[PDB]
Amino acid sequence: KETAAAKFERQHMDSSTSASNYCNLMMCCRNLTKDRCKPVNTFVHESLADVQAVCSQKNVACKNGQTNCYQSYSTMSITDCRETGSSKYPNCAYKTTQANKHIIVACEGNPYVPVHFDASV
Amino acid sequence: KETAAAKFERQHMDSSTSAASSSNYCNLMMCCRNLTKDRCKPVNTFVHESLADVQAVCSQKNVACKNGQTNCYQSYSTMSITDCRETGSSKYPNCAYKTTQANKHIIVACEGNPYVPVHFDASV
Fold first, then answer.
1. Which residues contact A20 (CB under 8 A, 6 or more apart)?
2. Is A12 on the interface with B (CB under 8 A)?
3. Residue A45 annotated among the catalytic residues of the structure
4. Measured between alpha carbons, how far is A58 from B118 in angstroms, rounded to an integer?
5. Closest chain B residue to A99, measured at CA
6. How many domains does chain A have?
7. Cys-Cys link to A120, which of A101, A111, B45, B49 (CB 3.0-4.6 A)?
8. DSSP secondary structure string for all residues of A2-44
9. Annotated catalytic residue A102
10. Are A70 and A104 a contacting pair, CB within 8 Å?
11. Which residues sit directly before a break in chain A (C to N > 2.5 Å)?
């Protein structure tokens, strides 16, 4: 029969860091492991329209000193992908981390849309 | 090679679908954890910390349990949880839940040898 301990675990436990293979597959399918392992990459899960809108949100400095960067007013759902210590092209391997943070993107063009992911904050 | 806008989409955009949104987490979890088999459990919380961190609560802040027993304990700090509560149109056997994420202190009842959590009492 189920122990009281195991019943508490089934009813109430869902560990987030235990909860992924998402980064390994996505870094592969978006071609970010093609000729080298991209070291770090962030994926944003909000709608394309909500991300494009960031270009008219808070104007901030880009890491490189340019001033065409914009920070989202609200935090957004993202997943950070970071190589593991053992990752080694052509066998790239990533640690997957979900977060809700402000994103900062560089915008340019007509339409004025995102062209570079600068940081999450 | 693509335009710089297209390259940003390829490198950084993975918009969630309606089906993969966290709004559906409880509907999935209440079913996969067998909490809707005999009836719709009205309220149930999931804790997203490690089992080790939840087990450690048994040696943190002793507090009265809702039912009057005294083997309850509150975590010293908030924890990442999800509250699952039936919506108004939930009707067994088609249970429906409202998914609510939060960072809140939790209170569990502990018992046994080893002394571990056996019941989730409340989030505060």
1. A96
2. yes
3. no
4. 48
5. B80
6. 1
7. A101
8. --HHHHHHHHHB--TTT---HHHHHHHHTTTTSSS--SEEEEE
9. no
10. yes
11. 19
Tell me the nearest-neighbour CA distance from A58 into chain B, angstroms: 19
Q: Which experimental approach was used here?
A: X-ray
d(CA A41, CA A81): 5
Q: Measuring CA to CA, which residue among A118, A85, A90, A87 is closest to residue A104?
A: A118
Task: From B15, B12, B7, B23, select the one nearest A50 (Cα to Cα).
Answer: B15
Quickly tell me which residue has 């994420």 as its tokens: B101
- CATH number for the domain spanning A78: value is 3.10.130.10
Within an 8 Å CB–CB cutoff, is residue B16 touching chain A? yes
A32: amino acid identity, one letter: L
A43 near B CB under 8 A: yes
Give the single-character DSSP code of B3.
-
CA distance A21 to A28: 11
Resolution (A): 1.9
CB A68 within 8 A of CB A62: yes
